[PDB]
Enzyme design. Structure first.
Site, PDB file in Angstrom:
ATOM      1  N   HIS E 201      -2.780  26.118 -31.730  1.00  0.00           N
ATOM      2  CA  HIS E 201      -2.274  26.998 -32.773  1.00  0.00           C
ATOM      3  C   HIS E 201      -1.712  28.303 -32.234  1.00  0.00           C
ATOM      4  O   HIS E 201      -1.132  29.064 -33.015  1.00  0.00           O
ATOM      5  CB  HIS E 201      -3.373  27.296 -33.793  1.00  0.00           C
ATOM      6  CG  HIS E 201      -3.692  26.142 -34.690  1.00  0.00           C
ATOM      7  ND1 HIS E 201      -4.703  26.182 -35.625  1.00  0.00           N
ATOM      8  CD2 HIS E 201      -3.140  24.909 -34.786  1.00  0.00           C
ATOM      9  CE1 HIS E 201      -4.758  25.026 -36.261  1.00  0.00           C
ATOM     10  NE2 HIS E 201      -3.821  24.235 -35.770  1.00  0.00           N
ATOM     11  N   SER E 205       3.003  22.942 -33.055  1.00  0.00           N
ATOM     12  CA  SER E 205       3.033  21.562 -32.601  1.00  0.00           C
ATOM     13  C   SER E 205       4.402  21.198 -32.036  1.00  0.00           C
ATOM     14  O   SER E 205       5.406  21.872 -32.276  1.00  0.00           O
ATOM     15  CB  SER E 205       2.678  20.610 -33.742  1.00  0.00           C
ATOM     16  OG  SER E 205       1.303  20.686 -34.065  1.00  0.00           O
ATOM     17  N   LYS E 227      -0.329  13.190 -45.982  1.00  0.00           N
ATOM     18  CA  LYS E 227      -0.050  12.244 -44.905  1.00  0.00           C
ATOM     19  C   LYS E 227      -1.304  11.943 -44.090  1.00  0.00           C
ATOM     20  O   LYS E 227      -1.554  10.786 -43.727  1.00  0.00           O
ATOM     21  CB  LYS E 227       1.060  12.789 -44.009  1.00  0.00           C
ATOM     22  CG  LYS E 227       1.877  11.719 -43.315  1.00  0.00           C
ATOM     23  CD  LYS E 227       3.210  12.268 -42.849  1.00  0.00           C
ATOM     24  CE  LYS E 227       3.896  11.312 -41.892  1.00  0.00           C
ATOM     25  NZ  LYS E 227       5.181  11.864 -41.389  1.00  0.00           N
ATOM     26  N   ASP E 228      -2.118  12.967 -43.820  1.00  0.00           N
ATOM     27  CA  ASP E 228      -3.379  12.763 -43.123  1.00  0.00           C
ATOM     28  C   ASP E 228      -4.369  12.002 -43.991  1.00  0.00           C
ATOM     29  O   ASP E 228      -5.156  11.209 -43.474  1.00  0.00           O
ATOM     30  CB  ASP E 228      -3.958  14.110 -42.697  1.00  0.00           C
ATOM     31  CG  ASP E 228      -3.312  14.648 -41.434  1.00  0.00           C
ATOM     32  OD1 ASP E 228      -2.253  14.123 -41.035  1.00  0.00           O
ATOM     33  OD2 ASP E 228      -3.855  15.607 -40.849  1.00  0.00           O
ATOM     34  N   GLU E 271     -18.091  -1.618 -22.002  1.00  0.00           N
ATOM     35  CA  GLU E 271     -17.336  -1.932 -23.202  1.00  0.00           C
ATOM     36  C   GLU E 271     -15.849  -1.662 -22.914  1.00  0.00           C
ATOM     37  O   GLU E 271     -15.506  -1.014 -21.919  1.00  0.00           O
ATOM     38  CB  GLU E 271     -17.944  -1.158 -24.385  1.00  0.00           C
ATOM     39  CG  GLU E 271     -17.382  -1.394 -25.790  1.00  0.00           C
ATOM     40  CD  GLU E 271     -18.126  -0.609 -26.857  1.00  0.00           C
ATOM     41  OE1 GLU E 271     -19.066   0.132 -26.503  1.00  0.00           O
ATOM     42  OE2 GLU E 271     -17.775  -0.734 -28.050  1.00  0.00           O
TER      43      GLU E 271
HETATM   44  C1  HEM Z   1     -24.312  13.614 -32.488  1.00  0.00           C
HETATM   45  C2  HEM Z   1     -23.927  12.470 -33.046  1.00  0.00           C
HETATM   46  C3  HEM Z   1     -24.443  11.152 -32.624  1.00  0.00           C
HETATM   47  C4  HEM Z   1     -25.710  10.667 -32.725  1.00  0.00           C
HETATM   48  C5  HEM Z   1     -26.912  11.371 -33.291  1.00  0.00           C
HETATM   49  C6  HEM Z   1     -25.705   9.353 -32.198  1.00  0.00           C
HETATM   50  C7  HEM Z   1     -26.880   8.596 -32.171  1.00  0.00           C
HETATM   51  C8  HEM Z   1     -26.881   7.283 -31.766  1.00  0.00           C
HETATM   52  C9  HEM Z   1     -27.986   6.417 -31.801  1.00  0.00           C
HETATM   53  C10 HEM Z   1     -29.370   6.755 -32.288  1.00  0.00           C
HETATM   54  C11 HEM Z   1     -27.580   5.218 -31.319  1.00  0.00           C
HETATM   55  C12 HEM Z   1     -28.448   3.996 -31.168  1.00  0.00           C
HETATM   56  C13 HEM Z   1     -28.350   3.096 -32.397  1.00  0.00           C
HETATM   57  C14 HEM Z   1     -27.422   1.951 -32.098  1.00  0.00           C
HETATM   58  O1  HEM Z   1     -27.759   1.089 -31.326  1.00  0.00           O
HETATM   59  O2  HEM Z   1     -26.220   1.890 -32.686  1.00  0.00           O
HETATM   60  C15 HEM Z   1     -26.218   5.328 -30.973  1.00  0.00           C
HETATM   61  C16 HEM Z   1     -25.483   4.285 -30.450  1.00  0.00           C
HETATM   62  C17 HEM Z   1     -24.169   4.427 -30.026  1.00  0.00           C
HETATM   63  N1  HEM Z   1     -23.392   5.509 -30.127  1.00  0.00           N
HETATM   64 FE1  HEM Z   1     -23.942   7.263 -30.945  1.00  0.00          FE
HETATM   65  N2  HEM Z   1     -24.473   9.023 -31.777  1.00  0.00           N
HETATM   66  C18 HEM Z   1     -23.656  10.066 -32.006  1.00  0.00           C
HETATM   67  C19 HEM Z   1     -22.300  10.201 -31.739  1.00  0.00           C
HETATM   68  C20 HEM Z   1     -21.595   9.220 -31.072  1.00  0.00           C
HETATM   69  C21 HEM Z   1     -20.254   9.322 -30.687  1.00  0.00           C
HETATM   70  C22 HEM Z   1     -19.351  10.507 -30.923  1.00  0.00           C
HETATM   71  C23 HEM Z   1     -19.926   8.141 -30.053  1.00  0.00           C
HETATM   72  C24 HEM Z   1     -18.618   7.786 -29.477  1.00  0.00           C
HETATM   73  C25 HEM Z   1     -18.227   8.306 -28.320  1.00  0.00           C
HETATM   74  C26 HEM Z   1     -21.080   7.316 -30.060  1.00  0.00           C
HETATM   75  C27 HEM Z   1     -21.102   6.064 -29.498  1.00  0.00           C
HETATM   76  C28 HEM Z   1     -22.203   5.224 -29.601  1.00  0.00           C
HETATM   77  C29 HEM Z   1     -22.196   3.843 -29.117  1.00  0.00           C
HETATM   78  C30 HEM Z   1     -21.052   3.122 -28.454  1.00  0.00           C
HETATM   79  C31 HEM Z   1     -23.415   3.345 -29.382  1.00  0.00           C
HETATM   80  C32 HEM Z   1     -23.887   1.947 -29.083  1.00  0.00           C
HETATM   81  C33 HEM Z   1     -23.750   1.121 -30.362  1.00  0.00           C
HETATM   82  C34 HEM Z   1     -24.228  -0.285 -30.134  1.00  0.00           C
HETATM   83  O3  HEM Z   1     -25.539  -0.557 -30.128  1.00  0.00           O
HETATM   84  O4  HEM Z   1     -23.427  -1.171 -29.963  1.00  0.00           O
HETATM   85  N3  HEM Z   1     -22.095   8.007 -30.688  1.00  0.00           N
HETATM   86  N4  HEM Z   1     -25.808   6.611 -31.259  1.00  0.00           N
HETATM   87  C1  HEM Z   2     -11.764  14.592 -28.841  1.00  0.00           C
HETATM   88  C2  HEM Z   2     -10.667  14.018 -29.319  1.00  0.00           C
HETATM   89  C3  HEM Z   2      -9.511  14.837 -29.720  1.00  0.00           C
HETATM   90  C4  HEM Z   2      -9.357  15.501 -30.895  1.00  0.00           C
HETATM   91  C5  HEM Z   2     -10.331  15.564 -32.042  1.00  0.00           C
HETATM   92  C6  HEM Z   2      -8.100  16.141 -30.847  1.00  0.00           C
HETATM   93  C7  HEM Z   2      -7.661  16.892 -31.933  1.00  0.00           C
HETATM   94  C8  HEM Z   2      -6.343  17.259 -32.041  1.00  0.00           C
HETATM   95  C9  HEM Z   2      -5.720  17.756 -33.195  1.00  0.00           C
HETATM   96  C10 HEM Z   2      -6.373  17.958 -34.538  1.00  0.00           C
HETATM   97  C11 HEM Z   2      -4.424  18.007 -32.881  1.00  0.00           C
HETATM   98  C12 HEM Z   2      -3.390  18.552 -33.830  1.00  0.00           C
HETATM   99  C13 HEM Z   2      -2.732  17.438 -34.654  1.00  0.00           C
HETATM  100  C14 HEM Z   2      -1.867  16.553 -33.798  1.00  0.00           C
HETATM  101  O1  HEM Z   2      -0.885  17.004 -33.261  1.00  0.00           O
HETATM  102  O2  HEM Z   2      -2.182  15.261 -33.632  1.00  0.00           O
HETATM  103  C15 HEM Z   2      -4.234  17.674 -31.522  1.00  0.00           C
HETATM  104  C16 HEM Z   2      -3.039  17.816 -30.849  1.00  0.00           C
HETATM  105  C17 HEM Z   2      -2.914  17.661 -29.469  1.00  0.00           C
HETATM  106  N1  HEM Z   2      -3.832  17.188 -28.624  1.00  0.00           N
HETATM  107 FE1  HEM Z   2      -5.669  16.584 -29.145  1.00  0.00          FE
HETATM  108  N2  HEM Z   2      -7.484  15.889 -29.682  1.00  0.00           N
HETATM  109  C18 HEM Z   2      -8.277  15.096 -28.943  1.00  0.00           C
HETATM  110  C19 HEM Z   2      -8.051  14.562 -27.677  1.00  0.00           C
HETATM  111  C20 HEM Z   2      -6.991  14.988 -26.902  1.00  0.00           C
HETATM  112  C21 HEM Z   2      -6.788  14.647 -25.568  1.00  0.00           C
HETATM  113  C22 HEM Z   2      -7.699  13.751 -24.776  1.00  0.00           C
HETATM  114  C23 HEM Z   2      -5.623  15.271 -25.156  1.00  0.00           C
HETATM  115  C24 HEM Z   2      -5.019  15.224 -23.812  1.00  0.00           C
HETATM  116  C25 HEM Z   2      -4.455  14.125 -23.332  1.00  0.00           C
HETATM  117  C26 HEM Z   2      -5.114  15.993 -26.269  1.00  0.00           C
HETATM  118  C27 HEM Z   2      -3.965  16.747 -26.227  1.00  0.00           C
HETATM  119  C28 HEM Z   2      -3.338  17.178 -27.392  1.00  0.00           C
HETATM  120  C29 HEM Z   2      -1.976  17.695 -27.418  1.00  0.00           C
HETATM  121  C30 HEM Z   2      -1.080  17.850 -26.222  1.00  0.00           C
HETATM  122  C31 HEM Z   2      -1.701  17.996 -28.702  1.00  0.00           C
HETATM  123  C32 HEM Z   2      -0.405  18.573 -29.212  1.00  0.00           C
HETATM  124  C33 HEM Z   2       0.394  17.550 -30.013  1.00  0.00           C
HETATM  125  C34 HEM Z   2       1.851  17.906 -30.017  1.00  0.00           C
HETATM  126  O3  HEM Z   2       2.243  19.119 -30.429  1.00  0.00           O
HETATM  127  O4  HEM Z   2       2.659  17.089 -29.651  1.00  0.00           O
HETATM  128  N3  HEM Z   2      -5.972  15.794 -27.328  1.00  0.00           N
HETATM  129  N4  HEM Z   2      -5.433  17.217 -31.028  1.00  0.00           N
END
Ligand code: HEM
Ligand code: HEM
Ligand SMILES: CCCCCCCCCCCCCCCCCC(=O)OC[C@H](COP(=O)([O-])OCC(O)COP(=O)([O-])OC[C@@H](COC(=O)CCCCCCCCCCCCCCCCC)OC(=O)CCCCCCCCCCCCCCCCC)OC(=O)CCCCCCCCCCCCCCCCC
Ligand SMILES: CCCCCCCCCCCCCCCCCC(=O)OC[C@H](COP(=O)(O)OCCN)OC(=O)CCCCCCCCCCCCCCCCC
Ligand SMILES: CCCCCCCCCCCCCCCCCC(=O)OC[C@H](COP(=O)(O)OCCN)OC(=O)CCCCCCCCCCCCCCCCC
Ligand SMILES: CCCCCCCCCCCCCCCCCC(=O)OC[C@H](COP(=O)(O)OCCN)OC(=O)CCCCCCCCCCCCCCCCC
Ligand code: HEC
Lengths: 241, 60, 80, 68, 380
Positions: E201, E205, E227-228, E271
């Site tokens: 910001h 963009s 749109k979002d 995975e």
């Molecule tokens: C702070 C927020 C989050 C909490 C408290 C949380 C908590 C948990 C817990 C308790 C499990 C085990 C239950 C299960 O087997 O599904 C789990 C599994 C998992 N979580 Fe999260 N999680 C969080 C955010 C995320 C996020 C952001 C991701 C992605 C990057 C993620 C990816 C996963 C995956 C891939 C598994 C394995 C699922 C499976 O059993 O196949 N989690 N999470």
């Molecule tokens: C954790 C996951 C991410 C979130 C939640 C996130 C969130 C956002 C949001 C809300 C925007 C503004 C809306 C849009 O333009 O799509 C944005 C734009 C952008 N993000 Fe991310 N982002 C993530 C991951 C990344 C990663 C991994 C990269 C680097 C490769 C990245 C680079 C950018 C760039 C360069 C823009 C500008 C878009 C443009 O003006 O063309 N973001 N992101």
């Protein structure tokens, strides 16, 4: 041999996208498990109260639970005691520990069949092909005692004797208990045991498809309203020359 | 002679509070009708297989 | 610091717009949507598609090469 | 009055097809080759697998219509 | 009176970042994806919180607690499979967001790009420890393999691996600390995303033409709001048809077995969104070489803004670099396919050629192609 044989696709009654399970087949497969499969295999994550509203009523499942004996305690003298089972009881263990299963099954461990169509490639097709695929080994390969040839088992040498033949049990509804019918019923029961939420999941999916079919064109129409104020905008450059 | 969307705008859609009221009333009525219709579709797809279709055979 | 009012310097530009309640949300949707989609896909298909085509060929060749790698060689067990 | 398994009847009806009988012919050529040799480490599990793959494919095409 | 939207100090930030924000009028549907990522983050957090009220991080009871969630908690299977397929949807939206940033030249916003690649590293670590959390067969052996190859660092690697493990192997302490870290990192991801939005910001963009869009900007509300919302609805459609119809098409069946330290699986995978990096990690017959290959395969996005040698920001008017970009997407898909395959012929030579081609296209071929494209327009 390291070569593997994939099981074929069978036309299951739950194979379709919104197709639920046949609950009479789950009831028959539970009978098959109770009379045949429960001697060696365990069902640690399935209780009798899960059968209520699926295959049996409350009193039928209560009678099924009270047919068996469950270890319980401690008593007021501090000693263990047998009691009749109830609806909250899980399915009884065949063995108290896996080493007893190793000792009783010639070194092999019969796995817990609560996720057995979720933990194997093929699902219930693999279970049906394993149960109905026992055959004589070919020439060149030889096997010892405690081993049986099964082309769908990896390595083709399974430690499980063929447990299902024609009329291995008697059904409650008078269905002829052939090997294919009993294997199909127990595969349906194991599919339910791995996925008890299956019919509710597909009903939720049907409601989701109907709601998205209602809501996607309407949200698209709102977006195209609020953007067709801009998508017909016309520009003009008028320099003073 | 006014049409149906014109009368719907004149009676309900003009005020935002009446818009909210007809949204809530239509939400509850649509919820009831949609659950009834989607359920009836679901047992029409899977007749004779669910527990409520074979339930009468085993209850005493 | 960067809001409407101080973005760019524009001179002599006239814009015309109408109300969304005045115009249709889908003005000739299919009859002009189909040729526009066809024009976009014919301007981008030669840049996009042939890499994924050769990914499909490499994937099929690798799978079939692994399958004949697991195949038994008949040249063995021929001398005796 | 033995209770006839429909899987068996479907199994020989599916073995009457052509890919199954060709794979069965290769299986008999293999057991003729292997069983007539004294010392070898050859095992032909792979065209038994081919025969079973074709046969159980056409069995699974039409087995479940005969099961209640 | 007083305009409350532009004067109230909490509503002023919300206004400046979501309502009266000047956005380019011509940004396509790809610009939806980042907002989807934020929604996915919230969805994951919400589902994760409702997994945390019943999950126990004990090696005796973790698998039992997961089965209790799936079988006895009301709609607990729904929340668990929503969490798993929402992690998969998070990585789909993340890959498409990064691909949008690579294609349209958005990496020239260097601070936004670097905060992005930090967010990408944090999300990968969170997903890895989350996949370890259910304590299946596949979770234990994936954690064991990843930490064993992390032990390749000289003179500190064994000490660092035993420090991460809290013991001689992957045990109860590893699972409990992985539960704590998997709980705590998505809030750091949310804070880093706030920094990501701030660093975007400062400058607005980018648009798909890559030009200065200051002459044509529209308010974010209601255009990109609706749109979002439409993109959120479509992403929810794909997520619920992934959960309610094919709940195990992306997971592994061997994770439904309990963790056996005595039994090893015949083929070990992470995975799918890690898989291509795994292929790069096994494209070199050296442990340190594979580890540094994985690290630079993720960090080459951070190296990307220094490789831009063209006078045009976007690839809309650059066909040769478009061809090279789609070849890069092609062999990224190839590396994803190889990463799920066992290590025999011809997967070894295909993965080696794919890794060599990946690094040569990003490092060498695109700047040379940009120089050639500048020469064709009589600019160089
Ligand atoms: C702070 C927020 C989050 C909490 C408290 C949380 C908590 C948990 C817990 C308790 C499990 C085990 C239950 C299960 O087997 O599904 C789990 C599994 C998992 N979580 Fe999260 N999680 C969080 C955010 C995320 C996020 C952001 C991701 C992605 C990057 C993620 C990816 C996963 C995956 C891939 C598994 C394995 C699922 C499976 O059993 O196949 N989690 N999470
Ligand atoms: C954790 C996951 C991410 C979130 C939640 C996130 C969130 C956002 C949001 C809300 C925007 C503004 C809306 C849009 O333009 O799509 C944005 C734009 C952008 N993000 Fe991310 N982002 C993530 C991951 C990344 C990663 C991994 C990269 C680097 C490769 C990245 C680079 C950018 C760039 C360069 C823009 C500008 C878009 C443009 O003006 O063309 N973001 N992101
Ligand atoms: C083809 C037959 C119909 C036809 O000709 O349509 C023309 C029409 C294009 O007409 P045009 O006048 O050339 O372009 C102006 C757009 O209509 C202007 O609309 P738009 O396409 O810019 O709309 C914004 C965009 C917004 O899209 C998103 O937000 C997508 C978000 C990313 C995908 C979901 C995330 C997960 C991805 C996992 C992989 O929506 C779409 O792209 C289509 C939305 C469809 C909603 C459901 C309709 C039923 O085609 C489409 O809109 C394609 C989709 C519908 C068919
Ligand atoms: C945060 C985002 C969370 C996920 C959002 C989509 C969740 C969809 C879903 O699982 O809906 C389930 C629900 C099933 O309804 P049901 O349990 O049968 O009861 C209705 C009244 N008896 O299904 C429904 O209510 C209909 C489907 C709605 C789908 C979302 C539409 C927007
Ligand atoms: C799939 C279909 C893609 C497609 O249609 O691509 C062509 C399209 C053309 O768009 P453009 O070149 O901007 O021109 C508009 C028309 N004149 O170009 C685009 O739509 C551009 C798409 C950019 C983002 C593509 C992301 C693909 C997935 C990449 C994953 C890996 C990312 C790197 C990881 C490391
Ligand atoms: C010489 C071009 C002749 C074109 C004849 C067609 C008619 C043209 C006139 C009529 C207009 C038709 C529609 C035009 C659409 C837009 C214009 C267009 O398509 O132009 C051709 C396009 C761009 O041409 P340009 O970039 O100058 O060529 C350099 C080639 N490297 O170039 C292309 O589309 C060619 C793309 C070829 C890509 C080949 C990639 C092979 C390698 C893939 C490897 C993938 C990974 C493999 C595995 C790696 C790991 C093991
Ligand atoms: C005691 C003789 C058993 C009876 C009764 C049943 N099973 Fe079994 N089973 C048994 C052993 C000792 C083993 C392991 C053998 C080995 O070599 O690993 C098994 C294994 C299975 C499996 C798993 C197959 C796999 O690929 O791992 C399944 C799916 C299975 N058995 C099914 C099954 C069914 C449905 C039964 C009731 C008809 C049944 N078994 C009975 C021992 C015994």
């Amino acid at each position: 041999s390291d070569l593997e044989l994939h099981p074929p696709s069978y036309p299951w009654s739950h194979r379709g996208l919104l197709s639920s399970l046949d609950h009479t087949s789950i009831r028959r497969g539970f009978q098959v498990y109770k009379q045949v499969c429960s001697s060696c295999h365990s069902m640690d994550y399935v209780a009798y109260r899960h059968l209520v509203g699926v295959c049996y009523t409350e009193e039928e499942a209560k009678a099924l639970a009270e047919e068996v004996e469950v270890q319980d305690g401690p008593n007021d003298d501090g000693e263990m005691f047998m009691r009749p089972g109830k609806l909250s009881d899980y399915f009884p263990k065949p063995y108290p520990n896996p080493e007893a299963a190793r000792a009783a099954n010639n070194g092999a461990l019969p796995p817990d069949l609560s996720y057995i169509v979720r933990a194997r490639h093929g699902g219930e097709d693999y279970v049906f092909s394993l149960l109905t695929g026992y055959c004589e080994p070919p020439t060149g390969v030889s096997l010892r005692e405690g081993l049986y040839f099964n082309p769908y088992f990896p390595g083709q040498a399974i430690g499980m004797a063929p447990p299902i033949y024609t009329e291995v049990l008697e059904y409650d509804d008078g269905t002829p208990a052939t090997m294919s019918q009993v294997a199909k019923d127990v595969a349906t029961f194991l599919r339910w045991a791995s996925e008890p939420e299956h019919d509710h999941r597909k009903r939720m999916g049907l409601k989701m498809l109907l709601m998205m079919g209602l809501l996607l064109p309407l949200t698209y129409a709102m977006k195209r309203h609020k953007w067709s104020v801009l998508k017909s905008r016309k520009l003009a450059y008028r320099p003073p020359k | 002679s006014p049409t149906i969307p014109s009368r719907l705008y004149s009676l309900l859609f003009r005020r935002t509070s009446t818009f909210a009221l007809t949204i809530a009333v239509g939400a509850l009525f649509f919820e009831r009708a949609f659950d009834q219709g989607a359920d009836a579709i679901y047992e029409h797809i899977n007749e004779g297989k669910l527990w409520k279709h074979i339930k009468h055979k085993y209850e005493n | 610091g960067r809001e409407f009012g101080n973005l760019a310097r524009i001179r002599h530009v006239i814009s015309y717009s109408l109300s969304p309640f005045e115009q249709r949300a889908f003005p000739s949707y299919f009859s002009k949507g189909i040729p526009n989609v066809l024009r976009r896909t014919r301007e981008r298909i030669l840049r996009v598609a042939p890499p994924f085509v050769v990914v499909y060929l490499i994937y099929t060749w690798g799978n079939q090469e692994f399958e004949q790698s697991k195949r038994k060689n008949p040249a063995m067990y021929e001398n005796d | 009055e033995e209770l006839v398994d429909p899987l068996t009847t479907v199994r020989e009806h599916c073995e009457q097809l052509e890919k199954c009988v060709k794979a069965r012919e290769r299986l008999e050529l293999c057991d003729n080759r292997v069983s007539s040799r004294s010392q070898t480490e050859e095992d032909c599990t792979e065209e038994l697998f081919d025969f079973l793959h074709a046969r159980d494919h056409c069995v699974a095409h039409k087995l479940f219509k005969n099961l209640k | 009176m007083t305009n409350m939207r532009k004067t109230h100090p909490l509503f002023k930030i919300i206004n400046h970042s979501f309502i009266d924000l000047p956005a380019p009028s011509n940004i396509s549907s790809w610009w939806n994806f980042g907002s989807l990522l934020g929604v996915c983050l919230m969805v994951q957090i919400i589902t994760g919180l409702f997994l945390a009220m019943h999950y126990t991080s004990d090696t005796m009871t973790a698998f039992s607690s997961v089965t209790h969630i799936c079988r006895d908690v009301n709609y607990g299977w729904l929340i668990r499979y929503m969490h798993a397929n929402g992690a998969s949807m998070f990585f789909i939206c993340l890959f498409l967001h990064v691909g949008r940033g690579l294609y349209y030249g958005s990496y020239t916003f260097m601070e936004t790009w670097n905060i992005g690649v930090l967010l990408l590293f944090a999300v990968m670590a969170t997903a890895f420890m989350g996949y370890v959390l259910p304590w299946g067969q596949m979770s234990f052996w994936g954690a064991t393999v990843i930490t064993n190859l992390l032990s390749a660092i000289p003179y500190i690697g064994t000490t660092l691996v035993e420090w991460i493990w809290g013991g001689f192997s992957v045990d109860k302490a590893t699972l409990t600390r992985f539960f704590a870290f998997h709980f705590i990192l998505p809030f750091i991801i949310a804070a880093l995303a706030i920094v990501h939005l701030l660093f975007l910001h400062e400058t607005g963009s980018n648009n798909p033409t890559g030009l200065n869009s200051d002459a044509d900007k529209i308010p974010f509300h209601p255009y990109y709001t609706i749109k979002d919302i439409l993109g959120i609805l479509i992403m929810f459609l794909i997520l619920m048809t992934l959960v309610l119809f094919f709940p195990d098409m992306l997971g592994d069946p061997d994770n439904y077995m309990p963790a056996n330290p005595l039994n090893t699986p015949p083929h070990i995978k992470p995975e799918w969104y890690f898989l291509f990096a795994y292929a790069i990690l096994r494209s070199i017959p050296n442990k340190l070489g594979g580890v540094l290959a994985l690290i630079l395969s993720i960090l080459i996005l951070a190296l990307m803004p220094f490789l831009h040698t063209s006078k045009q920001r976007s690839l809309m008017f650059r066909p040769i670099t478009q061809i090279l970009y789609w070849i890069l997407v092609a062999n990224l898909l190839i590396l994803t396919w190889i990463g799920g395959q066992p290590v025999e012929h011809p997967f070894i030579i295909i993965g080696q050629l794919a890794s060599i081609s990946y690094f040569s296209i990003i490092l060498i071929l695109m700047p040379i192609s940009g120089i050639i494209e500048d020469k064709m327009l009589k600019l160089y």
